[PDB]
């Protein structure tokens, strides 16, 4: 009676969500096909097919009455006759033009009102019919479920829990019905708006053009007379204005249309993601709080701290068994058997500095009393665990959690279908959750690092949020874009890039090599060169390219703004106290080697430009070089060469060719232009 | 969100129900109401029509929202 | 340079082996590069022709080829072109430098040098590049001694390579450098002595046949070179198939380097300056040579290559070769017209160039009810076929593993000296040995086989799509495949597009199309119905699949039953798309037992001994996952990439069907005489431009198939291959779990450590310990493996038009990567605008001139225009855009402060739209998209759709004249002027509009960015006619909006914060408001009033909040209260703080203020 009950929910939710996305550009109708046999609509035009029936006739099939409208004859306008004056006959001409414009707008509004009265109301009653059909399908299912409960022959006096299950199932069926109706309305409103704009206005425009021509004739005859009063120049200007204006078509303004996509998209994120947020544990004004405001009985340990994070301060669990955060569970966070729920949080897990915690799984956040959910951290892998009274799920993220990078992990649990885990908006694994039923315990949601053998181990958490809906891939990737709405430049860890902090600088290609300088006395030039490569040894004996190598470059500004670096800001890298820039004369015409202010023989154009041509969330940025008259604008890159008798090195150069053809290059060559800007951050240390 | 609401059937507020008629009172007091802009809901050709009374455009303008 | 006399690069040497006549013949060679020779003659050892039994499927075999001076000179020029192209990139010239100094190990006994060419005295030759042998299409690297090409000594191989003919694999020509780079990399292995001896083989595919369940084993050397994605799957961090070869070669390299480091490096007088060459040859590590694959070189040259199965996927079709005219069709920058617009000529000619094709497994469908025979030809690669034995008895190595054998260096060939190797003089003079070990010159292959079939295979379906007759004959589409396989009409062709079939159901070439407007309308009608039919996709309830393409079933005869393809895929599952492999091998992965090692350290070093065992077991189970991913790739993913290709062909076949039905229309017009010369030239010109439009959406449909097939392939791994692997790990972990507990037992009485630490730290808790599965990895290997088969043209920006200023001069360039040649006059000024730089078009003579050499404007081509525009001064009638030649084209202008978009085509159809939203000196995001698919002209202002007017009756407006931007009447600000290849939609316009405010900058009324310490005039956004003015007529001074207005005197409000550092006012920052005057008083809050109090320590701090709905407004909010305008009391709306009250999720208009 639970298996059958979950199968009912799954089949109804999956089958009333059936849509057909035809891909005609700017139409892209998401037709739900089941309206075909649900409602006897398209059987006349094409029996047995509804999506195909829409193609043959977009509205004629969907509606029972095409009106074939008409509008009055629209007699042309006229003017007064009398002993007029120049300054006022000019105003008469202007008023006539404005009146023609308002007449065009008024006839457009008349046909819009006719469309609303005859076309849109039919769409609304079609939606009402669809709601009747779907609601009666749901009530038939409810009749069958309550009949089945009325025959519970298996056991005695155990029907109460089954009755609660049926009530929750009916709620789920209603949610599926409302989603189906959202799709239906979404695809019918677009059809009606398209009909209004395409098949209705062009009928009007012919009569409006005839009226416009009549007005033009009357006005141009009004200027042949009274021309002496005007004067030749004013007559010429008025005639030109009349000829140009009273020859065009006035556009129909549909920004005030009743149902528009812009209305449905301007608040998409509020109505689809943030509306269902019942917890959002973050830091504001230096204090940890629920940013959603649903609950306030969140008590934090004495050894919890706030550290610099992804956008605003981040929660730092010191793992000392006294840095315990706990949220007393209320009716918002109590998830019953049939309640879908999602958990999204940013994590920054330090690189393990010592080998005493491998193979020891330790929890990160648990709502668990030998029944419930638990997010734990094994050796560089994040584990998500559900435990019912008998059943369980364990989903493991691959790796790279413990690489000291901000990772957004979002776990979406659709109780009917399955639990999916996404890391950085990309799906990792989905497991069947249809066998798990009760994961609800009254113990508080506990953020702690218990079962950790290291007393110094910590973890940065940010924006731990819980939603009462299963975000599908679209909403998950939308929520992952939301976090990068600002155009900040991100360092390798994922933090925003600042204006007075010294960073290690490395290319995406040639890992482990940082920037240094060498001076050429014969040329009098201080070249910037990738330093010698070095690698770091992990405690698990796997070698990786070192990040803290070379010299520390200091991002700067022309005025020391001390803000956060943005998408197209103009910067001035300062390595070892010397500004970096390209040559400002004809001396360096070979590949435009990038030099520093060290050595005053040649003048430099220091002002660089950080850009992010790729996606906003990438932890690397391109460094466009300034365009002086000598060198074209290029993207800072590196070439390995031995230009003269000095040793074979890697020289940094502006690469005017990459900037010009950047968007045509494949993703493999783009590796040459990317730069990482490594901070010196705790949690990653080679010592 | 956690209401467990079986049906989303709401009852109007008597304050807003009266505050609709106050707008009509204002229109009448300022000499604004015109009954010429009306939807005639009497159609016999389709033969399946809701058969409702004529709806004045002033009526939808007074109510506001999507219809207006 | 075919006739130089002699000396230096030009020599005449004696051939190593003997000619087919049985004697060695003299021949002359040309030194293209250091120690690299070319000889434009057919291979001397191989015969000029062979018998029909010896011929390979896909050869040429003509004997009167490359047998004249002109052809030899043509071959010689084809070479510098190719070698110049190789040397063009930096990685390419590093490989050539490595080859030039890759001389094999010199023979002993006075350091005699290795095999070379005698002169009638020895010229160093690392490679010798001959012409094509008996098989022109085959470019094989033949080492002159295979015995020493494997032991590590080396060999100077001979290459027989022909660059003139290339295959297609799709609608683009394969780059000949890939065929030459591959021959260079194969010879680099011979020079370093690292050859796999032709016995070390790895499974590549599941054999493409009907009654065969065997695999097609590839050579390990070819798998290393033809890298692609099939090479990334067995070269991960843990090495599982790493066998004696990757250790024997590495070991033999070490002592060879060591024996050079102590004997030859001591500078014997007989070495003759080979030390520098050997010092650089042995400085390079073979671990970097193995990283050099054929797909990373394609990415270096920006070539598109089928990375999925590089060694086989090019052979799954009839062998069609295209002649390349190198002086014209192939220059240093690759193909002159691009890889897709090559327009090469087919090799097929009557006299010579016979393409002997014997199709393996000629399959003929047979029906026992109907007299129906349908023969189709299958084509398969030449890789030799072995059984499942490799997977059956594959023994994992517990000890060997993560030791670096094959690591993919992201910086290919990057650790060596380029100029230093080049600056080294070449070798001359000293004698060389010659031990010519016989090469395999004789070989015979299997013949074709005729095996029947009881069901219509996808190859049968792809044959039916083709049109198999001349041009002067009717075309009749149909959906019943049984009416096509029974060739009763010979012109009926099967189509799986019901919409296209219905169009052709009632269509006659005589009366359906009768005028130019109808021909254009019909061409558009085909493009609409073709787009609807192939791009339709439906969501599915199967987990792991986002959407399902319903036309695949009707194209390849997979799950093609009376049920719908979506419905049929439900009950038959995803495994119905694949012929199930019954003998799939799941590794057993036996875990070795623990030894009884003893050292008194700590307590018999248990912690270290178990830690290495634990990480070895974890690695061992990772190789099993890697072994099973490789097995799934060659057994189940091959059957899915085979579908993606069969699909490409069916869409391509459907597309050329619609082109062969339009070309037939421009044959009733021409021949009959129906349309004049001027009108006729338009239809031919328009049909030619329409070909690139059909291939735009054909590629879009194939992109949908690429994602759908990837989800199907991953699903088969998810619940058909992976779960059986986890079950074996379950039984094997319990063995390792039991083995560790058995060994820990010591009777040593240390029960605290064993129970607490040892038994949980170094012991597998469950299979969650070792799962290794993530969909983010299978997506990476299977994404765009065969991409841009149709065209490389996508939804891109063909113009962005950025700008920069230096000193007093400016520049304007194309930022979109198209590198358009923008022309302008240098008097144009560039000033800051809306989050970008804007060009100030002030005078009438100032102009920005954008060429349209690649911006087509045909009636089938949709485009959009996006920019930010502000009218600096009050101008009533000015022009903005102009793309009209001889009264044909489009233009945008301003008419009485109203936008005027008018455009007319070459047929005389004029469309005009006069937007009446009254542009008034404010930044406007005017983006307008012309969608030609649905004939819709959308104009989005500030991210909001306003017009959507139809554009149906307007045809092509193509013009040669470039786009000209000039105000011509006043001063305007133009910014971010982008012209796009695709029509922008409401969702994407809003996203682009939002990104303009991503800087989170507060903006004044005119749209500029608000600034600190700058004085503005304040308005409440509700009464813009009345300015907020300070009131001093009372002792309690305050700010209020006055209605008397007897005396007008404006007051200026400037945003000032305590720190005079920031210059640009961002959103959500603490600011104070300063009022200009001799006192210069600030704003505080007293009893919610907004009185003016002097001194800068009594003011109040306001947090500015901006709403995107009204972007030129500010909210001065303190805590939850925002500044508000009170009710009128004495003709003065004094300003007070009030709790923010919302209306439609946003506060009221009163709380918003504007700065002027």
Numbering used by the authors:
A (entry chain X): 620 to 1306
B (entry chain X): 208 to 275
C (entry chain N): 9 to 128, 139 to 1174
Question: Which text from the study accompanies this structure?
Answer:
All BoNTs are naturally co-expressed with a protective partner protein (NTNH) with which they form a 300 kDa complex, to resist acidic and proteolytic attack from the digestive tract. We have previously identified a new botulinum neurotoxin serotype, BoNT/X, that has unique and therapeutically attractive properties. We present the cryo-EM structure of the BoNT/X-NTNH/X complex and the crystal structure of the isolated NTNH protein. BoNTs are 150 kDa proteins and consist of three domains: the 50 kDa catalytically active light chain (LC) and the 100 kDa heavy chain that is further divided into the translocation domain (HN) and the receptor-binding domain (HC).
